[PDB]
Design a protein around this nucleic acid. Structure first.
Ligand SMILES: Nc1ncnc2c1ncn2[C@@H]1O[C@H](COP(=O)(O)OP(=O)(O)NP(=O)(O)O)[C@@H](O)[C@H]1O
Ligand SMILES: Nc1ncnc2c1ncn2[C@@H]1O[C@H](COP(=O)(O)OP(=O)(O)NP(=O)(O)O)[C@@H](O)[C@H]1O
Ligand SMILES: [Mg+2]
Ligand SMILES: [Mg+2]
Lengths: 632, 646
DNA sequence: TCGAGCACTGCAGTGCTCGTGTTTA
DNA sequence: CGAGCACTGCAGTGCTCGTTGTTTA
């Protein structure tokens, strides 16, 4: 309300952005200059000065992390009276639109989302089916190919070419398998929803009417299908605010090209730019490091932020003996921080790839220090969880090929490979769902003796649980199914436990969760406990922390080897470095190991070039500081 | 004792053979003329008149039933009390020798006898290990070879063609294998024992000095290695008596050739023939039939065979509508005989092959009619029994290949196929046994993890049973081996169908031992006992096993072309006159009444076949046979009807 | 008939081979 | 190094296809 409390903190350029006329505006600026602060306040202003309805406001961005930040800051300022405005990820909002419109979207109301592992598998089987050798046409290669097409909003038909006309064939097969199965992968969510507004002008006209105010954070993350989606939703009616930093462009590998920025200026009516120039997040030391670091990339522009702040502590650089010594030294410095009254949560440990988290996790455990690893939607990746959730999915729909496959013979119940190759082929040949094929092959006797009887048993079971829990609440249904499938019995007696604990926790998760049950759960997914924050440098973008530790600062790790090999992704790695550095508020610490063990082999990586690119006066090497003098 | 009685019964020619000087004599005569009587009485004569020692008399024959038959008449004439007199079969006495002289024979003090089944199985393994094609050298066709050779006395040596040299090798391979394992097959008993005298003159001496009185019944049963064995023991000092009938020569398939009767006349010092002619067993009708029947074979010096007896009842002839009806028909006839005071034991149901006894049994069981099937050693051939004994055999000699195989993975010990394929090689190459080739590959760790894990558990288990039941008697010793080997629990589950009587046989095997080198000696007691327990029961056995015996009522079933004469016999040509001789034997077992039956149809090897009655039936004299009528009046003669109406 | 030999199928244990890398409900 | 196979091996379940007969401890 009190417009005065909206403008008090803001500086010149921020004010101009927040208190501007309703127009298409781009706020371009480096890290920690208040772009997100601006976007959030701009929402408050659209509401009290321009008296705009909360319903006409869509705040969207790419990662869950960044969306949560927006969502969070929007609460602190407007005490969650926001009820009405849409604040989420592109995928999230796309999902939302496709659910409530599955009809014009040619999607069965209870469509299932196909994640990576599930997509990877459906592709394997689909290729092995099409009678194609795994090594000549690798599954992953097909996934990348397919997702890439959708990232560009290209359907199979849209595409005279070489040995990709075949890939173009696998793509088409895949679509068919998914549609028939009622599955939708991530890339699909965005593409479908876009098509939605292209073939249902009345639905589009509806939204253009509702969402007159569109705001996008971390804009340089948006790829082509996402850009189009927004340009479309805006038309000539919508007024949009995009904020970003081309220096933090780190999703090239998924279609997000820097150009989408200048593109916005060319495409949206009367588009204009506002440039923030003052950093408020970090000490002068960190910021000078950042600027120097980014300054190594070519082209760019040269905006350079500045700060009143004092130099502050230096950037710590510790050369660990190996990956264990690395984790240990980090956990050590966090303790000191804690012992002097610092919150664990005010500390983040950042790495280039998730693989690096295991060693850190063990050191943290080994020191009884609480922590959170944001593998964002990874708990449901764990074998046991994917299995449990698969029975449920079948219960929801038998056509969930992905689900049918994962447990038809898990736990083992006769139904072996042979029996299945028959069923699979049936689906391939008669264009049916794995369950649809079984339906027939049974009422056709075609199956063997103990064979058609093992399959019969199963199908009786799946349908059996779909009755017993057709009343029970998701929290108890997820309990019964787990025991009545033998998943419990089968896991317990495995030797190698912690695995079964997760199943029980899944029960609790479903238990304390906000038709509904359907997706509602698997989708949306206890923070009061102070804990150390662990996440990839990519996920950290948009976030900030008082104490920041970036591990694995070595050539081959960061910059990753891939980037090093196909020598072209290096300015992007340096931009990711920039992200990492600009995340630190008070203290930044970078560590690297003289030796670590990868693919069972000791390697001695050279120190990352990024460490050297930092100004010597901001970096201070960590030097460590007798034991009793030296019977039988 | 009182000579007077040893001769009172006898007729002219019988007397001349019984009360004759100690010399080599041959009594050649038709069936039921008293040859066996003569032979038994000769013994008493050689004992009271010639004052010979019972220890000097050896009465030998080929079949257990025939031998058992002598054993009985001897004991009835001289009162069991007959010192150390040897009465048994060739193989049996041959066995008794090799046992009391294993060292000189070169056999372990426990050599195990390899029956027809194991022998064939052992040949399988062996044939594979030589990478020889399974159907290029059939193991069956191999067993037939080796044995035929031994029947002659030949050893691997035999040479003089490609095929020849092959088998020759298979043969030798086999021999060696047995010697290692310490296994002896039936043919090995006769050949080894023969050799034992050719290779131990002092030993032979001992026996020639002991058995100066040799008597053989059913001589025409002797083949070459058996003739040799006798000519030997007799040398130039022994006095032998052989009795037989060339018309009852029914073992050509195993060497026993008619020639041996002349050979005896040529090779034995003083040899002389005595011919009997009066039959005392059968009714005139029955004899008239046997005679008419045998005359159809060519090349017969025309043996006498007459009788004072009345005509007696006709030969009953019955055409059944199927095999089961045939059984119930016999059971019906035997029942009428029993209901009139006759004894079931005076009734024999004879047949061409053993398979034919299954339906008879079912019928008798169904009628609650006590019957005994003289199958011989076919109880220990049964699966559950073979296994149970395969264990005990290993406990008495780890080198028992035959055994080791069988029980190694039974009950499933994890020791699967390939695991053995190797040990099989570890033996074909190393030149060891299966247990020796195993104890090696262990303290040599040349086998996988899961593999050697169990293959050791096995090795250990048998050794455990050996050292655990080493004391206790045989009957309880068997009770432990059975249960503690898993078998008790194995055959316990498995079916819940036919696996029911399978476990009860293992119990009967326990009883058999309770009512008794124990293990090997156990098997011999059974071979005897397998030949006549006076609890009135109908007798079932083959026409072969019956030769030598007699019964008031006889029933020959399966008088069908393709059964008797068996199909095969029809191919070889010369086998046919042998079948007619087997038919002669059959007819001549009947004392009072004979009944022949044949089925309109029967299912052989899952197929409803339709045979024509056996030619042997028509060969009999019509005035000797009365067919069992299946209808009251004779089919009224119907005149011809002029109809050009197709 | 039906038992041994052959192909089929499922499941458990084993060396041999070789590489998500970042996000998305 | 460790998930993923490709392999080897033991078992259990239809099948066919092929059968041959007598005795011996
Ligand atoms: N005018 C201001 N006075 C005081 N604090 C401010 C001001 N503007 C922004 N901040 C704070 O400065 C920090 C950085 O702001 P933030 O809005 O997160 O930057 P950003 O531009 O979104 N960075 P990035 O996501 O890295 O591109 C936050 O802690 C804000 O709360
Ligand atoms: N002189 C006799 N007086 C009375 N009964 C006799 C006489 N001779 C033999 N028998 C009996 O006649 C039957 C047949 O005798 P047996 O000695 O068995 O004949 P066999 O010549 O051995 N016949 P086979 O073995 O078939 O070639 C038996 O019941 C004898 O007990
Ligand atoms: Mg921001
Ligand atoms: Mg006789």
């Amino acid at each position: 309300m009190d417009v005065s409390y909206l403008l008090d903190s803001l500086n010149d350029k921020q004010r101009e952005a927040v208190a501007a006329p309703r127009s298409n505006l781009l706020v371009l600026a480096g890290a920690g200059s208040g772009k997100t602060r601006v976007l959030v306040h701009r929402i408050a202003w659209l509401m009290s000065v321009e008296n705009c309805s909360p319903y006409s406001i869509m705040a969207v961005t790419f990662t869950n992390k960044a969306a949560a930040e927006m969502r969070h800051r929007i609460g602190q300022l407007m005490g969650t009276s926001q009820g009405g405005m849409w604040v989420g990820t592109f995928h999230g909002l796309a999902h939302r639109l496709l659910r409530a419109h599955h009809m014009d979207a040619n999607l069965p109301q209870d469509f299932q989302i196909l994640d990576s592992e599930d997509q990877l598998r459906l592709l394997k089987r689909l290729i092995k089916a099409m009678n194609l050798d795994e090594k000549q046409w690798p599954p992953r290669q097909a996934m990348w190919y397919i997702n890439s097409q959708k990232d560009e909003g290209l359907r199979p038909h849209h595409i005279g070419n070489p040995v990709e006309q075949t890939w173009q064939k696998v793509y088409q097969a895949y679509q068919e398998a998914c549609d028939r199965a009622g599955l939708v992968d991530f890339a699909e969510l965005l593409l479908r929803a876009h098509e939605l507004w292209l073939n249902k002008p009345h639905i589009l006209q509806h939204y253009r009417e509702r969402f007159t105010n569109i705001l996008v954070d971390e804009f340089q993350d948006t790829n082509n299908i996402q850009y189009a989606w927004i340009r479309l939703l805006a038309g000539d009616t919508g007024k949009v605010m995009i904020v970003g930093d081309d220096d933090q462009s780190i999703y090239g590998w998924r279609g997000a090209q820097v150009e989408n920025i200048q593109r916005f200026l060319n495409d949206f009516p009367g588009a204009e730019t506002i440039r923030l120039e003052q950093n408020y997040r970090s000490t002068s030391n960190i910021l000078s490091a950042a600027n120097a670091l980014i300054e190594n990339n070519n082209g760019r522009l040269g905006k350079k932020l500045w700060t009143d702040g004092a130099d502050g502590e230096p950037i710590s650089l510790y050369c660990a003996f190996n990956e264990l010594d690395e984790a240990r030294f980090v956990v050590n410095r966090i303790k000191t921080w804690q012992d002097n009254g610092g919150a664990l949560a005010e500390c983040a440990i950042l790495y280039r790839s998730n693989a690096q988290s295991r060693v850190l996790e063990e050191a943290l455990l080994q020191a009884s220090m609480p922590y959170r690893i944001y593998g964002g939607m990874r708990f449901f990746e764990r074998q046991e969880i994917k299995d449990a959730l698969s029975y449920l999915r079948l219960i929801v729909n038998r056509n969930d090929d992905a689900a049918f496959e994962r447990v038809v013979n898990t736990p083992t119940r006769g139904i072996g490979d042979r029996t299945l190759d028959v069923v699979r082929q049936t689906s391939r040949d008669r264009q049916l769902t794995l369950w649809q094929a079984c339906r027939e092959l049974l009422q056709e006797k075609a199956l063997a003796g103990r064979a058609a009887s093992a399959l019969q048993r199963f199908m009786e079971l799946i349908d059996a649980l779909a009755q017993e829990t057709a009343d029970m609440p998701l929290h108890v249904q997820t309990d019964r199914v787990i025991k009545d499938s033998g998943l419990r019995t089968m896991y317990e007696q495995e030797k190698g436990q912690t695995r079964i604990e997760n199943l029980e926790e899944l029960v609790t998760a479903t238990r304390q969760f906000s038709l509904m049950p359907l997706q509602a759960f698997l989708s949306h997914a206890d923070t009061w406990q102070d804990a150390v924050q662990l996440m990839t440098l990519h996920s950290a973008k948009g976030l900030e922390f008082p104490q920041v530790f970036i591990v694995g600062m070595e050539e081959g790790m960061f910059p990753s080897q891939m980037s090093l090999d196909e020598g072209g992704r290096l300015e992007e790695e340096r931009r990711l470095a920039y992200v990492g550095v600009t995340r630190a508020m008070q203290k930044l610490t970078l560590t690297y190991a003289e030796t670590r063990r990868l693919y069972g082999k000791e390697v001695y990586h050279r120190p990352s070039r990024f460490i050297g690119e930092l100004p010597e006066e901001c970096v201070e090497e960590v030097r460590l500081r007798v034991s009793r003098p030296v019977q039988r």
